[PDB]
Amino acid sequence: MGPVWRKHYITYRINNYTPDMNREDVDYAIRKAFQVWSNVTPLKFSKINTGMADILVVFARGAHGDDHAFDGKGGILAHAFGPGSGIGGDAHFDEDEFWTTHSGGTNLFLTAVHEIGHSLGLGHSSDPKAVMFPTYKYVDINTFRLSADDIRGIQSLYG
Ligand SMILES: COc1ccc(S(=O)(=O)N(CC(=O)NO)CC(C)C)cc1
Ligand SMILES: [Ca+2]
Ligand SMILES: [Ca+2]
Numbered sequence: 697m698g699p700v701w702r703k704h705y706i707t708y709r710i711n712n713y714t715p716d717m718n719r720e721d722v723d724y725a726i727r728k729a730f731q732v733w734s735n736v737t738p739l740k741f742s743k744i745n746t747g748m749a750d751i752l753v754v755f756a757r758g759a760h761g762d763d764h765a766f767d768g769k770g771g772i773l774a775h776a777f778g779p780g781s782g783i784g785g786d787a788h789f790d791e792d793e794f795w796t797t798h799s800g801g802t803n804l805f806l807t808a809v810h811e812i813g814h815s816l817g818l819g820h821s822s823d824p825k826a827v828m829f830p831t832y833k834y835v836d837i838n839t840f841r842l843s844a845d846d847i848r849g850i851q852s853l854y855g
């Protein structure tokens with residue numbers, strides 16, 4: 697298997713906030729996305745508002761300091777680094793997308809669930825029902841659930 701966090705208590709911090717959405721709505725989407733993974737593993741996530749965190753959540757555009765520049769509107773929506781120090785774990789969202797609560801634009805929550813999967817050590821799935829399948833598709837958020845493949849994947853890494 698690939699890198700995993702060698703601890704079950706994992707911190708995150710939101711570096712900055714997209715202007716596409718209300719700040720409260722970003723906080724909510726991210727909290728909910730971590731909860732999805734916490735709900736099927738022994739992992740515990742703690743939000744920090746200031747200081748050192750394992751997973752940094754970042755909205756940025758174009759070339760943004762890592763060796764993986766974003767590409768404008770469309771195309772690549774987001775990327776994340778697997779567990780490790782520094783940029784390890786970090787989840788980056790392309791600000792040239794239009795981030796949403798809803799079905800229009802790109803849903804932050806669903807994209808974050810995907811991204812968070814990578815920040816925890818998952819790669820892509822070949823199951824089209826899996827949140828880790830590498831195509832963005834809106835599905836009703838109130839009824840969203842991880843597929844059986846996603847749960848096998850993450851439980852193979854933790855627990
Ligand atoms: C559900 O969340 C996803 C997040 C990003 C992608 S992506 O289109 O930006 N993409 C990069 C991605 O894997 N980063 O995590 C797939 C790529 C194979 C085109 C698609 C779905
Ligand atoms: Ca990190
Ligand atoms: Ca893009």
Ligand SMILES: [Ca+2]
Binds near residue numbers: 714716790793
């Ligand atoms: Ca935007």
Ligand SMILES: [Zn+2]
Binds near residue numbers: 760762764775788
């Ligand atoms: Zn990046």
Ligand SMILES: [Zn+2]
Binds near residue numbers: 810814820830
């Ligand atoms: Zn991905």
